[PDB]
Design a protein around this ligand. Sequence first.
Ligand SMILES: *CC(=O)N1CC2(C1)CN(S(=O)(=O)c1ccc(Br)cc1)CCO2
Ligand SMILES: *CC(=O)N1CC2(C1)CN(S(=O)(=O)c1ccc(Br)cc1)CCO2
Ligand SMILES: [Cl-]
Ligand SMILES: [Cl-]
Ligand SMILES: [Mg+2]
Ligand SMILES: [Mg+2]
Ligand SMILES: [Mg+2]
Ligand SMILES: [Mg+2]
Lengths: 234, 234, 9, 9
Amino acid sequence: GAMGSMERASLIQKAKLAEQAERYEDMAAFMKGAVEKGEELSCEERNLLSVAYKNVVGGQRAAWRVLSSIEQKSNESEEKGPEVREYREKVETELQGVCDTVLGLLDSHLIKEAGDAESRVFYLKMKGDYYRYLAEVATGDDKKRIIDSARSAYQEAMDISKKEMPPTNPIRLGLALNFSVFHYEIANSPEEAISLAKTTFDEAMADLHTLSEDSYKDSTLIMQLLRDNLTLWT
Amino acid sequence: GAMGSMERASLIQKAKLAEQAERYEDMAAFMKGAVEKGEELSCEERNLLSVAYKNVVGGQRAAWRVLSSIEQKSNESEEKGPEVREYREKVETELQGVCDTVLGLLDSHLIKEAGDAESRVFYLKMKGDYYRYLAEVATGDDKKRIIDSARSAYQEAMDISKKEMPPTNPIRLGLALNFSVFHYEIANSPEEAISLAKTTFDEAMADLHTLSEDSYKDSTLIMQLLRDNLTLWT
Amino acid sequence: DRSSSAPNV
Amino acid sequence: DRSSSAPNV
Ligand SMILES: *CC(=O)N1CC2(C1)CN(S(=O)(=O)c1ccc(Br)cc1)CCO2
Ligand SMILES: *CC(=O)N1CC2(C1)CN(S(=O)(=O)c1ccc(Br)cc1)CCO2
Ligand SMILES: [Cl-]
Ligand SMILES: [Cl-]
Ligand SMILES: [Mg+2]
Ligand SMILES: [Mg+2]
Ligand SMILES: [Mg+2]
Ligand SMILES: [Mg+2]
């Protein structure tokens, strides 16, 4: 693509620079370029890919929510014409395009080459996450299929994580957190959400004793998010 | 341009929506489209134009400063190759392009049609500001000419503001603030900066008695910024 | 308020 | 720290 002439190492270096400069669109383009080199990504490089796209789509999601809220208020209200809907649709399309880009990278060919637990679970979690973001804005005949695609990716990731990783592994914990959010916010399954969050928290608690000081800090940070959700949900 | 098929009123409506959604690149594109309709802008519309481009260029300036700082540190240090300079140059070029876009709108044809004091001073202040942003990154044979262009725009604005507006007018105050920043940060003229800030503050103080409660709040807000700078500078 | 998903790390 | 210029209003 557009980054085809830049060295892989230069793309990673520039992604790190873009991160420091809070230039997340640039960061995502650099990391897309790096993925398109065709080599597998290290843990650090997967982190850069994740941070870049999360920030890009995060801005889009926040904007979409603002616009959807204005649109819902107008449709109850003095007629304002098509502009609110048009602009919401514009932001929605751009958001869908980012999600499709990420899903395309995962499908061509990150997931299929990912054989270690940390890589495969990370990528399948990501697949679940970006289908979940598609589901947040879906309203037509594919909302159900999008939700099922998210579910299927999260489930495959969960099955591997339970077999191959300790209950305190940050990737395993972040996956379970996000799958619980999927259940609560997308799948209309609050009880499944609560059960997953509780079981995850409890199994991690029981394994903290095995960890170093640094790993303990990492795991307990994510456990606190499970607890914050459980407080919100119960 | 790209917004040529959208109604002027729809462009303004969408700029307001983009502002609420914190989508400032979109906001700037909508307002550029509105300017290109060829009609003069109201006070509110000038505000939308200003907010959109200020936020866009503000992000670029912050990124450029981060990258310039990394670059200066490397050039003293283990050789890291051309990437830091390349990426700083990329951000710099994009910043220059935004400034050139704004300056082009002012030149074609906002300034020449602006006959009232509030519009003409606002646009000439803006011209000074965007030359000032160009000056922040300039290092070659045109740094002097860029600084003089900023100075000339600010001076013309100052001359009109002193003849046509009260000393508490927010546009007059914001102009004097920014011209004082020009003197201190760009023109290596800290004494001129301090003198302008002091005289501006004092003449505004003496005119506060004429104002309503709401206008008082507006003026004193900007006066506080003059005072904050004077505290920094002395 | 919405549920918290995994943050950037 | 840098001088303060006019903020958004
Ligand atoms: C080592 C490795 O592959 N990575 C990717 C990660 C470190 C972890 N992921 S994540 O989405 O799995 C995640 C885990 C824990 C938290 Br609090 C947040 C996100 C993000 C990128 O870096
Ligand atoms: C009425 C009108 O033309 N405008 C433009 C403005 C209201 C004022 N400007 S400004 O750059 O002159 C400015 C004045 C005061 C402050 Br605290 C900040 C900026 C900004 C856009 O709105
Ligand atoms: Cl639109
Ligand atoms: Cl570059
Ligand atoms: Mg749509
Ligand atoms: Mg129950
Ligand atoms: Mg240059
Ligand atoms: Mg002196």
